[PDB]
Amino acid sequence: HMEGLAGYVYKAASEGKVLTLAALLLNRSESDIRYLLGYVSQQGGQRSTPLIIAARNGHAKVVRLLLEHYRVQTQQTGTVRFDGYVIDGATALWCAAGAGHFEVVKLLVSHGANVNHTTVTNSTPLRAACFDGRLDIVKYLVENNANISIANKYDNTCLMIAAYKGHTDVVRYLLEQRADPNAKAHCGATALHFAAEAGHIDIVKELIKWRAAIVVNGHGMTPLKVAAESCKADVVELLLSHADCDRRSRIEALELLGASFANDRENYDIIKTYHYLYLAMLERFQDGILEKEVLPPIHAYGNRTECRNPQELESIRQDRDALHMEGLIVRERILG
Ligand SMILES: CCCSc1nc2[nH]ncc2c(=O)[nH]1
């Protein structure tokens, strides 16, 4: 029933009171030490050890103490509340990368610490740091044999998450190193797709510099066509400017974008809806001629039919109501 002392040892580690930890651990047999330092504590919905919690909270001195003076295994795993969620299989190192405590990361890998050890979702400490964009920690792990190519349970790579979260700094580092831009995920998405849907313009230029392939989403959508739907005009124009997309791919990208400008109540701008929907119409009719098969007018979208000719489109250039409808219809055709 001596686990009462273990709760004081845990509390000392959690709070970073290194001298309190020191006092508690002295005067104790080796049998006692392994017990108190290896006690899995269920405080909260979690499960962790003194070393892990010190790491999770960036208590370097407490962490430096347990390693150099009590030879505590760094392979200890646990379950830890982070940004809302509770992550299972985390080591002191992984927790310290997610929480962004560089100096504790240094301590842990300096001693024995598997930089490639994965959580239950298969997240390396590198992925953690990549999610949060601490370039200092990302650089250090990579330089100590962290594997850039281990991806999570769903093939989400370190580069993909850095692109999604918009860590331009981290993205460029991974590309200069080992990182494969052309990797796909369980849903078909690549680093480019993510960095397109979220409109991280700088990152898209970086991925272009590294000859990343334009491939199709699990939805059959090129990163260009994903930026259209996410109504990311800047990104769409960028991809269109480097790429040599067949007139159809171009037209469908311009339409999907323009259409996305009328409904997207966050970036809603019906006059840009005209700019792109009209531009795609000219591209249709430059001739040698890409005509479009519209859908019959349903009550849901008034009872309008989608403009077939360029002349039909100019007829609503100033009727913001009919253009707001037109966007809903074009997109209804292309996606839904
Ligand atoms: C909030 C700081 C990072 S928490 C986190 N969540 C994840 N989900 N899938 C992988 C990972 C990872 O490496 N870290």
Author numbering: 0 to 287, 290 to 337
The authors write:
Protein fem‐1 homolog B (FEM1B) is a substrate recognition protein of the Cullin‐RING (CUL2) E3 ligase and plays a critical role in regulating proteins in the cell (Chen et al., 2021, 2024; Hughes et al., 2021; Kramer & Zhang, 2022; Manford et al., 2021; Raiff et al., 2025; Zhao et al., 2021). Here, we describe the development of a stable construct of FEM1B, the results of a protein‐observed NMR‐based fragment screen using this construct, and the X‐ray structures of some of the fragment hits when bound to the protein.
The six additional molecules which are classified as chemical shift pattern 3 sit in the same binding pocket. The other six fragments bound to the same site in the FEM1B substrate binding pocket, a region typically important for identifying C‐terminal prolines of degron substrates in a non‐covalent manner.
